[PDB]
Every structure is written in C-alpha cells, then in structure tokens.
C-alpha cells in the first residue's frame, strides 16, 4: 500500500487529514474547528517567546510586560498577538459551539464529542483568566481577587481553599507566581483534550447541514477541505492583523495599563468581554452562594441538551420554530453581555434577571416543548387517518 498508509506515524496523519471521508455538503461553519487549532498554536508559540522575557514576581510582572512592549524586538507584536488572539479564540469558540447547537451536533452518537468540548471550554476560560492575572494591572489584581473568592462560597471549607489558592492573606507574590506557572501548564492539558476531542470525532465523522447520514457521498479531506480551510485561515489572519496592527487595545481595558493596587478598586472595573454574559448571570442573583452556583450551572446546562432535545431529526435546518427560538437564544446571550457591561441600575437589573431566566429556560423548557410540538406537526401534516 502507499507509504502514507503503511507507516505508523503517517497513517495517523493520513486517516485524520488526507483520506478522511467528509460529507460532501458541509459548509463554511465546519471550518471553525481548524481555526481553533490554529488559535491554540498562536497562543502557545507567542506565549513561549514572551515567557523568555517575563518575570512573575509581583514587583516585576507589570514592568516585565512593559519591557516586552518597549525593549524586545517585535515584542509588541507578540504581546498584541497573544492578547487579541485570546479574544479571537473566544469569538471562534462561541461560533463553533453555536454551530453545534444549531445543527444538533451534540446529539447521539456525538454526545461524548460534545461533553469533551464542554470540558475544553471550561479549561480555556480558566487559562485566559490565569494569563490575564500575569499582567498584574488593576483588572488583573481584582480579577484574581474576585475569581479566587468564588470558592469562598463553598460550605465550611471555602475560606481555607481561598487562602490556599492565594498562598497567604491576600492576592500577593505567591499568587501571581503560581498563576504564571499554571498558565503555562493548562494550554498543554487543553492540547491533550483536543486530541481526545478529535478521537471521538473520528469514529463517527462530522455531521452535515441536512442533519442526515453522510455515508452515501463522501469526498476526501485532502484537496477539498484542506484548501477550503485555507480560505478561512487567511480571512481569520487578515482580521486578526487589522486589530493587532491598527487597533490593538480596542478589545481590552484601559485600567490594565495601571499597576495593580491592593488598596483601591477602580470604579471602572469591567470583566473581559468574553466573560460578560456569565458575569451578568451571577450579578442577577442577590445572594452570594446562589450567584456562583447559578453562574457555574449556566455552563454545565450545556450537558443537558442531548436529553432535552426530543426531536426525531438532527438539527434546525428544516425546523421553523426551532430556528426562531435559536436566534432568540443567541441575541439573548448578546443582551446578557451588554447587561454585564452596564451599571447595577434600575432597568438593567431586571432585564438581566429576565435574560438569565430565558437562558436556562431555553435548554430546560423551550427546546423540549418546541421539539415535541414540531414532532407532532411533522406527523399530522402527512398522515391521513
């Protein structure tokens, strides 16, 4: 047989990237996964080269990043690629997830694929938080403070967890040095989880926009989707380039150009944009414990969709009510984020509490009810007895 098949290492490459049978009809929404692998590579490469110049001591961390910006040849390019790339990593992840939601990709037999995806998402959120703390600007210090304090809500042994996470009385040198060490580690665990993600993908193959079997018409990955991937790889790079060179600070927060100050929390504190919907959800609950429980539950409830989707067909392409409510969900999610960016003030507090309800009601109530109704509508529209 061909060497690409017979060799032990190359056959892996062949079965995943060259001869892998793809459904002929997958559209550009199926390009997001390769863009996520690319993102993971950009973050790791730029982070390692920056690590070469970075000091994690709480006295030196902010200045060591200014040193990367000012003194390291092309240092500002590395830092701006890393920071803007993290944002682009989330944009593309949301689209990858939204794609999965729309086309019923979470369904059997791809439940394991979906569950591993949810783990990667949690890990990616934790990784970006650890990195954000390493700058040690004002947003870094108070981000580290607020988020480590999430665990203080744990019954009896919560404040013990927090002081253990801090390595002392407050967010200090121990804290920032261990958060750098952890920020370096977790990207490699994400890489191992991506391999597990691709393993589960390989045994059943991709789904497609029709939601039905792809077995009757496959075309090889190589050529067709290699070069189709290339189209969105360049478009992705173009847009990332426009930010990195022309607008490098538009997606960040001006307060993180101020060194962290343990005695002063700025009035202008706002979470990173990709954390805003979740922040809003927590802020909507006027109780400490229940605030952090509900926020975590907003991530875990993604695990419930294979069971509450009662439909008998995969995906929303031929489903009028499901399409409509899907876009209610998406724009509700954007609202949650716009609420997160706002002050805790009259109209906003209520809107956030209602949007929070809509968020959970989608998975637990709307999808099971609507998919049942659509099941029955499909039936009585064709059966004549």
């Amino acid at each position: 047989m061909a060497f690409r098949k017979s060799n032990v290492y190359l056959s892996l490459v062949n079965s995943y990237i060259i001869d892998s049978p793809q459904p002929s009809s997958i559209n550009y929404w199926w390009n997001m996964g390769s863009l996520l692998g690319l993102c993971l590579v950009i973050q790791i490469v730029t982070g390692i080269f920056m690590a070469m110049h970075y000091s994690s001591n709480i006295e030196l961390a902010f200045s060591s990043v200014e040193h990367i910006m000012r003194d390291v040849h092309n240092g500002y390019i590395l830092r701006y690629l890393h920071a803007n790339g993290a944002s682009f990593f989330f944009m593309v992840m949301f689209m990858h997830m939204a794609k999965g939601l729309y086309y019923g990709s979470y369904r059997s037999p791809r439940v394991t694929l979906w569950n591993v995806g949810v783990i990667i998402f949690t890990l990616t959120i934790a990784t970006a938080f650890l990195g954000y703390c390493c700058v040690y600007g004002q947003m870094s210090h108070w981000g580290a403070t607020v988020i480590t304090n999430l665990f203080s809500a744990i019954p009896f042994v919560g404040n013990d967890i927090v002081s253990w996470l801090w390595g002392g009385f407050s967010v200090s040198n121990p804290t920032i040095q261990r958060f750098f060490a952890l920020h370096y580690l977790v990207p490699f665990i994400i890489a191992a989880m991506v391999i597990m993600h691709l393993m589960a993908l390989h045994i059943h193959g991709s789904s497609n926009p029709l939601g039905i079997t792809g077995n009757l018409d496959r075309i090889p990955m190589h050529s067709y989707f290699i070069f189709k991937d290339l189209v969105t790889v360049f478009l992705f790079m173009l847009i990332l380039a426009l930010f990195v060179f022309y607008s490098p600070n538009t997606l960040g927060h001006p307060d993180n150009y101020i060194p962290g100050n343990p005695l002063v929390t700025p009035a202008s504190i706002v979470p990173e944009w990709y954390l805003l919907p979740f922040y809003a959800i927590l802020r909507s609950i006027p109780d400490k414990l229940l605030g952090v429980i509900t926020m975590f539950a907003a991530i875990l409830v993604l695990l419930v969709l294979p069971f509450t989707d009662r439909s008998v067909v995969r995906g929303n392409t031929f489903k009028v009510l499901s399409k409509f409510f899907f876009f209610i969900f998406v724009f509700n999610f954007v609202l949650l984020g716009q609420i997160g960016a706002c002050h805790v003030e009259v109209p906003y507090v209520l809107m956030g509490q209602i949007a929070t309800f809509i968020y959970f009601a989608y998975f637990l109530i709307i999808v099971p009810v609507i998919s049942t109704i659509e099941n029955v509508l499909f039936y009585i529209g064709r059966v004549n007895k």
Partner: protein, 245 residues
C-alpha cells in the same frame, strides 16, 4: 448614572496621527517634551521612558546626552565602599520629581500625580481625553457645585472634582522653533508627546501593518480562486437515477 459622575464625553479632535497611514508628527513630539520638562515634570514622573528612545525621534544623539547629564544618578561605590554619584547617560530612565510616594502626596495636598508613561493608554478617550482635560478648566464651577477645599472643577474628569489645578496658560513656554505657545497648542503638543511615550512603536507598527494587510488580503483573494478551481468538478457534478428492475 448622573452625567457629573460619568464625566463629560471628550470630543474627537483631528489628530494628525489618527488614520491607518499616519505617523506621529515628530515636531509636535519635540515641542511636547519641552512642555513636559518646563511644566509637568515638577509633579509628574515619566519612569518608563529611557533617554536613548528620544534619539532619532524628537532629538539628536547630542541633545539627549546633554539633557541626561544635567541629572545625577547613583553610581557604583568607589574602591573603599563609600557611595558616589554620576551624571546621567543614555541608558538611564528619565528621573522623576519625587523620591517616593509619601513625598509626592506631601507636595500635592495628599494627592498622587500619576506617572505619565502610559497615561494615554490608561484612560478611555486617549488623546481626546488628555487634551480636553488640560483645556477644559472653567474659570468658575457651574452654579450649585460645592467644591471641596483644595479641589478644582473640570467637567471631563469623573465626578468633576480634580486635585490638579489648571497649569497651562498662554505663553508660559518659549517654543524653541518659534511656534505661538497658546494653551491649546501646548496641550496639543504634550498630548502628542505622551502618546509617543505610551506607544513608541506607533509609526513602525502601522508600516508593518500595511505590508501584512496587503499580503494577507492577496492570499485571501487568491485562496478563494484556488478553492473554486479545486471544487469545480464537485460543484457541477450531475446525477441521474434509473430505478432498477
């Protein structure tokens, strides 16, 4: 939130460095340094800017050397271990007015004048904000506003009450290049200088972006064409069904 607590929205001035193809104006940077030296430096440090970065930007190698040597820095101890000082060199960072935080608060009614190395990036509004703040002190506060003793009013500062008085007045500086040193001219200049302090890579960054965006644009348009070609057999493929007997 109330408009006073938010602060007045700074308007958009036509900065000559705004726009994708635009470098800083380096004459304005040169002037802005003078305004910093003669007005601002009395209260504001500039800790992250080293003398050498001025060379080839706003001043000559010779000019910067003279400027640095006007300051004394700690040197290595002599053969016997007693401390000793030294004129400044190009490797040194621009020195600040105060020795520590406590001495800076003492000289300013208890307030701390921030370092200005990053101030343009560390505020919403950027150049527009800094400029507007410096030129936006009214002679009298709006009616009803009771200002704390030692505070000043400025509508662009959040809450209106700022601990820095107006410091720019017409012709308090003699511009080395002849330019009329009006307050709005001086504001325009320091602000341009402070944007450079915060973003020294500005001119070069945009030049690299121009190349990067042209190459990537072309690669994008090219890959579309190559994809369509590689897919043409599949896209125009035709099926016929003849049901089997």
């Amino acid at each position: 939130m109330t408009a006073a607590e938010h602060g007045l929205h700074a308007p958009a001035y036509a900065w000559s460095h705004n726009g994708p193809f635009e470098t800083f104006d380096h004459a304005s940077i040169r002037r802005g340094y003078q305004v910093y030296r003669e007005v601002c430096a009395a209260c504001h440090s500039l800790d992250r800017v080293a003398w050498r970065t001025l060379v080839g930007v706003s001043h000559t190698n010779e000019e910067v050397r003279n400027m640095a040597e006007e300051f004394e820095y700690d040197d290595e101890p002599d053969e016997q271990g007693n401390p000793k000082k030294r004129p400044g060199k190009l490797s040194d960072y621009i020195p600040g007015p105060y020795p520590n935080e406590q001495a800076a608060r003492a000289a300013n009614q208890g307030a701390l004048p921030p370092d200005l190395s990053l101030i343009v990036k560390a505020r919403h509004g950027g150049c527009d904000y800094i400029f507007s703040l410096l030129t936006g002190y009214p002679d009298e506060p709006p009616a009803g506003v009771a200002l704390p003793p030692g505070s000043n009013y400025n509508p662009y500062f959040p809450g209106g009450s700022i601990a820095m008085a107006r410091v720019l007045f017409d012709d308090m500086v003699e511009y080395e290049d002849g330019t009329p040193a009006t307050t709005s001219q001086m504001a325009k200049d320091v602000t341009t200088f402070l944007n450079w302090c915060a973003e020294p890579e500005h001119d070069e960054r945009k030049r690299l972006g121009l190349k990067t965006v042209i190459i990537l644009s072309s690669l994008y348009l090219l890959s579309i064409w190559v994809k369509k070609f590689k897919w043409a057999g599949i896209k125009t493929r035709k099926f016929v069904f003849n049901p089997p007997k």
